[model samples]
Target chain A: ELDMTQTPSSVSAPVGGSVTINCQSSQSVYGNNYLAWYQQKAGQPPKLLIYRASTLASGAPSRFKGSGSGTQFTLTISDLESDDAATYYCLGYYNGVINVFGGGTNVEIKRTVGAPSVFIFPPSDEQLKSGTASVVCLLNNFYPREAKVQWKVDNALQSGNSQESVTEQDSKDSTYSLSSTLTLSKADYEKHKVYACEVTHQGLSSPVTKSFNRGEC
Target chain B: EVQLQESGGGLVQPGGSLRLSCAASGRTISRYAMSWFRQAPGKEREFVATARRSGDGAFYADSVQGRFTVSRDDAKNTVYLQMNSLKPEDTAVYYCAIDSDTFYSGSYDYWGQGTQVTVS
Candidate 1:
């Protein structure tokens, strides 16, 4: 088994600048150098950035570069943009079975927007009367760009019913915005179970929540 | 136009087993390689297993050794992850991904929306 570690768990860099994240393995990762890098935004699936040591993935910008060998590896994103602020991870595959992942490095651009303003929109009356109901949550005016959104029913954690939309930025100001939707059966909606949207951002110490129930509708 | 959809996830007992399936659309399952990844709540993504395009076999991470089985059905154009000996710590959002390149050197370009499995 292999263990992977990343340095500088968090970093602050200016826009138009560059940031270098490092990854080290417990031992030599010599043969074939089957190493890759990934960029993951909050509420988004990871995207492959670099693979096979220093090779960039298709459609990856030239500003992203991967280098190093043996036990040490580095991923440098140059001319950083606000969207560059995300958690980066490294994966090392050895003997095909020893697949290890770095702890991840959080790149923060030097802009400040404390926390997201959260709101939840209840399902429409027509939809609530149907077999299924959908509720939307909007998170707007946030910076550093790292945030997670989750759904809960009756205060219990939920999965698989939520879909996160792409994160977008304001042209006037650099703050980010994201929206997510959760689906439930009309029976659950009519049951008046408390449905909540919980948001956790890098800037906040605790998660913030906004809830809605059938009664609220 | 490639889309991956995951299903067969739900509450599971600690000692019971869970079977997760990923259905492929707009692509043939046998022509490309696929991988499975899981992320625990408040955690980073962890690689679970992979099925090569060559159909030689599958590779599994040590974290799920002996408890995870990966298989694919060309007829259904679907991939499956069979996890045994479930634990509360095994709870996570499981995603299925397809490698962009034909070889399985690990360039996972496309992904599913992810299925959440809760091991109680």
Candidate 2:
């Protein structure tokens, strides 16, 4: 197994300041400096920032720079913007067959949002026609982008039944929305199972819970 | 509008073989790099493999070197992940991603919703 360590598990910086996250590998990356960096906000897919150790990804700002080689790599974000307050991950490719990722570094800026607007929606008429029905939970208008979602059926954890979508940013406000879908058999829907959606975000002191009953629809 | 959707993933018995796929739409699959990544229940994402759009061969990470084969079909604009001797730890959410840069540059810009494969 390949292992990499990231320093300063969490960082708090002020706007316009700078921060550097370091990633150290257990062994030489060998071949080339096949290291990369990605920025991932809560509930969203990661976006590439730097690749091949130092090359900036397309559309990435100069403020985000990557450097180092062999077993040591660093990602420096200068002139930090509020949007930069997300987890940054480091990845390494080796021997054409092995890939490893560093435990992410959580970056925090002085910004926050109210609790997300959580809603659970039942399967649509079209979706109900299938052998299995899909219910979706929407977590809207959240910030600091790190939110956790859990699903429960009749109070029993349904962890394996749900797949959460990548978070999407609101173009106008920069807030984020995450939607998760839960799949169940048509018979389960007919039984009118009570589904609950729970979301926990840094801005909220407690988890927000929303319930949906198939029979209501 | 580039979209990628994954399928052919579900439950598999231990030691079984499974084939997962990512279908590309709204863009030609051969113009960029197609990469695959996976995440276990509470683990960080891991790079699996990547096939270039040039019709050249693919690249695999060391972790899946022998048991995983990744290929792309230009005709169908699709990428496939085939794994043999699946194990309980192989259970994870597999994602197909598109890198906007040249081959071997791990800059994934577009990603699929991911397909979960459970090995029991």
Candidate 3:
């Protein structure tokens, strides 16, 4: 039988504060020192933080402090900062044949929020005659530096022709901006008269949309 | 042993095309399924696309949908991601991970250092 559960699977705290996230397994793992902890920033690989019970990996931050032992294992991050925002994971390798990855704990951070200004740019001349034509949906001055993008042709959801930009921090004001572009064939653009770009974020009560309407395509 | 790493990180202008590549080593790149994961700053990770081991299928996220084309060069042990019509917003660090288990189970044992593509 295999079983384990982690308490407070997620945690969000202000900077310079301290938070302790815990991991519990069905079996006594501390005696074997089979427990390992990893810190995975979103879109990055999991980095070994603590291995063999609570021993810090070489050159780990003084802030990623650890404590507790046996089945009641705990990992603490004191003097937390912005970079500490990442998902935490615990792996058990006692079985050797099969390793278990604990349900992850997402570390959240509280930061100043901002709003996005949405805009839809028109298609180009070449796309009208031949080659590839496309439209751009831009979101500027957005806050929390995170958001998702959605595209629609006419009224239905669309995908095959779209790719979104990564969110960027603006040094001028510290706000974030992101954009997504949808490519189309000259024929497809001519057939569909309207395209819409929808931006979704926690800061906005409703997703803000900008529609590009040209006479044809 | 299994290894997968991606490259072609840098800038692509808005309204242009983008392409990235993953170089695989250790195991037979044609035997294990490969997948791509995307991450933006301060956000949760998102799954984007996958290519089967037998070179039969390529699946993409609804958003990644037809927009991204995944192809393989068996002789070279390389996988590719090509996206057209970029936007300044199409920036993000993308990572490629190889799914090690194929026995109706799951495991991702190897991850490539991310390729940061900035479209401005």
Question: On a 0 to 100 scale, what is the lDDT of residue A204 in model 1?
Answer: 39
- Model 2 scores what on Cα lDDT? 0.79
Candidate 1 residues B1-120, lDDT tens each? 889999999998898898999999897878777778888878877667777655345656656867888898878889999999987878999999886656443546688999999987
Off by over 4 Å in 2: A1-14, A23-75, A82-110, A145-159, A166-176, A200-207, B1-120
* Model 2 residue A137 lDDT score: 90
| Per-residue alpha-carbon lDDT of candidate 2 for residues A91-196, written as tens digits (9 for 90 to 100) | 9988757889899998766332334788888888887787788888998876535567888888888767888775544434446678999899888778756888
lDDT of candidate 3 over A1-217, digit per residue (tens): 7755666886756566788888788776635567888988646799988988678998788777666566667889888777777788888765546577889887765434455788888887756776677788888875454467788888889967798775433434445678788888777777877788877653443456878676743
lDDT of residue B106 for candidate 1: 50
What would the TM-score be for candidate 2 when compared with the true structure?
A: 0.42
Error of 2 at B49 (Å): 43
lDDT of 3 at A80: 76
Docking quality band of candidate 2, CAPRI definitions: incorrect
The per-model DockQ list reads 0.01, 0.01, 0.01
lDDT of 3 by residue, B1-71 (tens): 66788997778787777778999887777776677777778876666676666533555554665467777
* C-alpha lDDT of all candidate models, in order: 0.79, 0.79, 0.71
Tell me, by lDDT, which candidate is best. Answer: 1
Give RMSD (Å) of candidate 1 vs. truth. 18.6
